[PDB]
Design an enzyme around this catalytic site. Sequence first.
Site, mmCIF file in Angstrom:
data_model
loop_
_atom_site.group_PDB
_atom_site.id
_atom_site.type_symbol
_atom_site.label_atom_id
_atom_site.label_comp_id
_atom_site.label_asym_id
_atom_site.label_seq_id
_atom_site.Cartn_x
_atom_site.Cartn_y
_atom_site.Cartn_z
ATOM 1 N N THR A 1 1.075 3.113 1.040
ATOM 2 C CA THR A 1 1.859 4.342 1.116
ATOM 3 C C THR A 1 3.013 4.198 2.102
ATOM 4 O O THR A 1 4.023 4.903 2.000
ATOM 5 C CB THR A 1 0.962 5.515 1.515
ATOM 6 O OG1 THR A 1 0.361 5.248 2.789
ATOM 7 C CG2 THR A 1 -0.129 5.727 0.482
ATOM 8 N N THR A 2 2.876 3.287 3.066
ATOM 9 C CA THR A 2 3.918 3.108 4.073
ATOM 10 C C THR A 2 5.184 2.518 3.466
ATOM 11 O O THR A 2 6.295 2.986 3.745
ATOM 12 C CB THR A 2 3.402 2.218 5.204
ATOM 13 O OG1 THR A 2 2.271 2.841 5.827
ATOM 14 C CG2 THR A 2 4.485 1.995 6.244
ATOM 15 N N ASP B 1 -15.112 -9.989 8.369
ATOM 16 C CA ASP B 1 -13.751 -9.471 8.448
ATOM 17 C C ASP B 1 -12.734 -10.432 7.846
ATOM 18 O O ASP B 1 -11.697 -9.985 7.346
ATOM 19 C CB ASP B 1 -13.386 -9.170 9.902
ATOM 20 C CG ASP B 1 -14.149 -7.986 10.462
ATOM 21 O OD1 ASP B 1 -14.721 -7.215 9.663
ATOM 22 O OD2 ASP B 1 -14.179 -7.828 11.700
#
Lengths: 230, 543, 518
Positions: free
Chosen positions: B94-95, B400
């Site tokens: 969205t950025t 991660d």
Amino acid sequence: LLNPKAESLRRDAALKVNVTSAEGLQSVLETNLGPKGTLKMLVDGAGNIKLTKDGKVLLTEMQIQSPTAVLIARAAAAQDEITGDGTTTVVCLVGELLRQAHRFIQEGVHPRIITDGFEIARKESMKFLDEFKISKTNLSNDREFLLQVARSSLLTKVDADLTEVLTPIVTDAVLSVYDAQADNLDLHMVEIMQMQHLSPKDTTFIKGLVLDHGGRHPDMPTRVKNAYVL
Amino acid sequence: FNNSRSDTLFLGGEKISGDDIRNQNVLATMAVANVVKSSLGPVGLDKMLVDDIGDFTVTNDGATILSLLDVQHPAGKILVELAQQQDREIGDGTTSVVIIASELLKRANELVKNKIHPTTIITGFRVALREAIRFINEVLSTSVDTLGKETLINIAKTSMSSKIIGADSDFFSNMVVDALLAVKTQNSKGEIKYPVKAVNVLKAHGKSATESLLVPGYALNCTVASQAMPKRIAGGNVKIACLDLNLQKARMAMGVQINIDDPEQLEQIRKREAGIVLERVKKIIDAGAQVVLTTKGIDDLCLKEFVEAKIMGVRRCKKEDLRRIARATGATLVSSMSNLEGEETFESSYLGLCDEVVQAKFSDDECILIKGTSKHSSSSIILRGANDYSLDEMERSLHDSLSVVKRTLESGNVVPGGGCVEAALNIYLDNFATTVGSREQLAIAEFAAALLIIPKTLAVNAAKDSSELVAKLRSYHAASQMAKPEDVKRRSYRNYGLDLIRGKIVDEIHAGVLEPTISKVKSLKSALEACVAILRIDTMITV
Amino acid sequence: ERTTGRQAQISNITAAKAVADVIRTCLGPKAMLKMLLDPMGGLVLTNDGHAILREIDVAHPAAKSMLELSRTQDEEVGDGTTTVIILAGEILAQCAPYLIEKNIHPVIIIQALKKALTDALEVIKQVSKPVDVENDAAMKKLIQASIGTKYVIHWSEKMCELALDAVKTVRKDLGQTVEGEPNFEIDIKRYVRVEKIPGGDVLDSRVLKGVLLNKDVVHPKMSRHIENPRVVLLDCPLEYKKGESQTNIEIEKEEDWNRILQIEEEQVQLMCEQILAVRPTLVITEKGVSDLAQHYLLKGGCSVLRRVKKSDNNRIARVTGATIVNRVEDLKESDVGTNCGLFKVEMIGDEYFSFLDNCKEPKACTIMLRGGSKDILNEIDRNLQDAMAVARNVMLSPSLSPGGGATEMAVSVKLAEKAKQLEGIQQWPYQAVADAMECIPRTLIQNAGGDPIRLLSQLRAKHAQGNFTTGIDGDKGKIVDMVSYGIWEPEVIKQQSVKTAIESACLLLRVDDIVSGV
């Protein structure tokens, strides 16, 4: 360094306000000290005028926004519970001690050194306190000396004409309640009753107890001597 | 400054039309977009979101910032709904989409001052979008460079660089990449996805981290418990039985005690208690199971039955591992043995299948290695570390790390990141502008130059000069696109993006920065539809 | 509404600078007093850093982050609340000209603060000196730092005994290359939980290993202590059970009425018989106990405790191992009562208690405190937690660091030496860290009254040529060695001090905008 709806007094500006806060409270209470002191009025807001020279009643009846006078009033309240006398004496010592300190604050002296100089002198004051004090005998025949102690607590708040009236009353009140030995004394055994219609110079001491409701009938005896109690 | 006081079209509010609303949409969209312009990319910085109560929160996620941002204008409200459309399709990005639609409005606002009608400005963007999708097709590529070299190890190296594991990471990244490619599976109807929860991770500290081993299969921590049974079976095949309920001598209840009044009932009840579980042991031997894995343990009498048959019994297996082993062997963990009135293992029904079971010596560790089951597509990692605190940081880092690796590789279609897509389309649409030659050429040229805002602001947040890198970013691609369409080349050397850590131009494919194609195509498509909705407003009626 | 450009970086530094500026006079044992003006007619003269900032209403959100920073420091260390806030506020103040006047990008400064944080932790470890943690006389002189200037100074020797004996019970000190090193884990919060008993003397305060119960024994004559106990924990009361469905017993025949009355007593005995099947020596229930169950369990040779809280039985289950089983017929034999030394019911302060105390340390203990009043017990309570917090930092690392500005200047000198050898744009913000480290000792000089400029440069000259152990005296205010009068504090205080300071400083530097919305 500010946010909305805030106020800050910083960089020695609070000291000039706090010392002035003591000078304002001092000059008011500087008027009444010792037997030469002055009388003040206290309005409770309900229309009742009360005249008293006692700093205990004064500080409680007045409202002061200055926080410096609040700590003085709160600490004097602790002094009024412990000592019970010399409320103005404590205030006059605090105000003038800040005035002499504020002169050195303008010279650039840090307040910690000023407060440390007070604690060191206070410890030396306690040493002179024990040396300067006079030890009085425990004899209860000391009423002559009690006449001197009475005039100390009386002459301050009265015209000195009520002193000769209240001197035999207060002195006889303590020694009558106090048995002869070292035990204690009870101030609750002394009743304080107020009456109207007669001059204050006629105030008398009551060895017994006083009460309101008497015998109602015209023929009842007014004076009965050495009677049994039921 | 503010637009108000219509004094036309009597009604319960004002009227804004002309260049008044066109300049208002630019000022409104700019202020809303300026929040996410500094958060772009990993070098971006998070911003604080304050509520009306006086509390706040700080996060760099563009989806949460735009959702919690208060926009009182319709032009920015479309951008708020644009973030909702972006979260419901891709779920991320969205950025960058807001920054695109913001620059497109600024470029279109200059076209209005050029006396170009906004309808053609809209159509000029749609024509450039049709070619932009076709141009990505020559950009996008499938999974490559995984054989003969590794570009995926640079992904794990940058992700584990913040942990102690990053010291040997060059050796550790090979363990993550080579495993993830080998564990590839197919779930249902041609998905071809990598297993999320596979590749079991275990930890033991005997030594340095360099000795961590990668097992092509499951590594179970257990022993044979008896030296009389062989440690290696299953040359061709084995049937593994995953069991929960114990094979131990059966009791009745923990609150009941057996008091024998009749000495006949003594021998009866005694042999009956062992006879119930012994028959259950007989059903296991008759089922053809060479390896027996039990969660609650095995008695000594029932274990001897496995010793004589050369069947491998194991006591107190981990039940969390047996659930994943049963899925790989096609087996089913048996919590209790029964069906209706019967008790048995159903003769190789709940039993599994595996190629070989061997017990390696780990030099002060001993475990069971499971290799080549029926359908697995999994593995296991045996970690060694400086301490348990180090092993904990390694297991958390491998999760991660692999997560960023497996999600990008889950889609077989990716494009280079770091500004390669925005810079390449700028060169393609620049030459495509000459294919029209009437009006939209001005709109298409501004559409291509508007894509340069993504790499520009990306380098600004990295504390690097945007005037140099962006100018060099375009030069390397423009020179590489000269000999490319001619199908004659000395050296190509395209796909050079921005490396913001070292502040230099490198190949993003070799650096490991990749984004799936579905993310970039839907980004330009969503940012354009949001920019059109703003350009279609010539009038605003505010009550 | 919105703060963009460099305006947000100004407001974030200004807010943190204002919070620190208030407590600058709150640092040190000689620290001044702060008079707060309430919206009402009241005032607050307290000099405690946490009690002041709590009474100060703040607006800018960065000031609220500094308040939450002190809340985290209070859970870690008991003292030095103003030390962390002033240090974290000065770092942002020193990095302010480099961020704006020098036009350095904030990420460059943030990456420079991470390098300065790693170098600072290495310098603190070099200037730290080891101490024996097993010496009882040494641990008393350490905790004594957080003792004096309090009412507990007279009992300080007994305050240290209650502090040491409590942490030594709950601590597990282990290490090896096989199963790993816990790094000397100590939990003060959950395991060291205290019970305060009024009356008595501080000398009578004992640290009991176990769970203390205020409820007495149901019968006066009973076994006072059992050698090898068997404990059963159950929430259900002890009394005649009734069915959950509709139960109606109609008695017509004459001789069947007394039989049902006997069955009701047998059902009470049956519920007690299910408990006695495991042969327990102790029975603890949450609710009350009927008089019949008291007699059935008295002849069964077991101890009975009633009206015990549920939260207490949960702490009993961890030091014992007995799991609470509701129904008496479901009682397991796996949960036992092992490792319980004595049942002693001995009366303390005219109130009958119950002791679970044992001879072993199942990672927990219950402290029994005695005092002259509840206010004395509250003073002993909070001082005991601060006493154990200092002993905890000594058990979590052997090395002690000098205070009074000695370590603060020792780091700033080493940072200035590493600054000359550190190339790159990060060198300029790296020098701002050393200038922020000099603010703490200069603050003690300003509170002392001496010349802050003259005494700071002379104190820096002592660290450059002489040793780093030369600090500033609190009572006097003149440069002296800290070896003479030990101000020495554990290193863990300095560790988390600079640690969270950089984390809190970088957090505010990362925020370039502030917006309002829900």
